[PDB]
């Protein structure tokens, strides 16, 4: 019902051969590099970092989520405790280094981006 009723006004306007096969999006080499800003007035430091990851189409990304699941997540708003099922979390419950931390996983179809994102 959503198929037939779906509009198909202007037709697709693109090639169907090898000529249109060239990517509209470049393969992208990773660049392990650092960018820093010092606005000291900022109430506190907010740091993130990223390693090169699997392309989004790539299944290789899938196991890494379980790996990310080892890192888990934590924040001060939770019930807290050093007992909890994460090291960085209990350290955050200890020296209070991480007000919060989290492992972002933004994989693009070309090349992905694993990484960490946190408040200290």
């Amino acid at each position: 019902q959503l198929l037939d009723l779906a509009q198909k006004h202007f037709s697709s306007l693109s090639g169907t051969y090898v000529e249109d096969a060239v990517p509209a999006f470049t393969p992208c080499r990773f660049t392990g590099s650092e960018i820093r800003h010092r606005d000291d007035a900022l109430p506190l430091a907010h740091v993130a970092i990223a390693v090169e990851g699997p392309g989004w189409a790539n299944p290789d990304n899938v196991p890494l989520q379980v790996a990310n699941a080892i890192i888990g997540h934590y924040d001060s708003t939770y019930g807290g405790g050093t007992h909890m099922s994460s090291t960085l979390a209990s350290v955050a419950a200890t020296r209070k280094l991480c007000q919060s931390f989290q492992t972002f996983n933004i994989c693009y179809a070309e090349t992905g981006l694993l990484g960490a994102h946190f408040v200290c």
């Binding site: 660049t31 650092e34 960018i35 800003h37 606005d39 007035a41």
Partner: protein, 80 residues
């Protein structure tokens, strides 16, 4: 002294990049050389005249001592 109490610098936007990516000797030749000469002359332009001073003091002092020492018997005429 730590990093926590050095100075309250504000905005700065750094852009470092990994050594592993970049070459160890980027334009190290043709770009490095002119700077070398450029600053070499920057040192010698001031430093050199002391070198010449020590040079003339050295040479003239040495020849001073030698002429003062070896030439003497001829200058004496003990046969006087």
């Amino acid at each position: 002294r730590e990093f926590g109490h050095l100075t309250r610098m504000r905005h700065v936007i750094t852009y470092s990049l990994s050594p592993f990516e970049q070459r160890a000797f980027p334009h190290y030749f043709t770009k490095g050389i002119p700077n070398v000469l450029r600053r070499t002359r920057a040192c010698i332009l001031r430093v050199a005249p002391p070198f010449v001073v020590f040079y003339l003091v050295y040479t003239w002092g040495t020849q001073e001592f030698e002429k003062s020492k070896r030439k003497n018997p001829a200058a004496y005429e003990n046969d006087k």
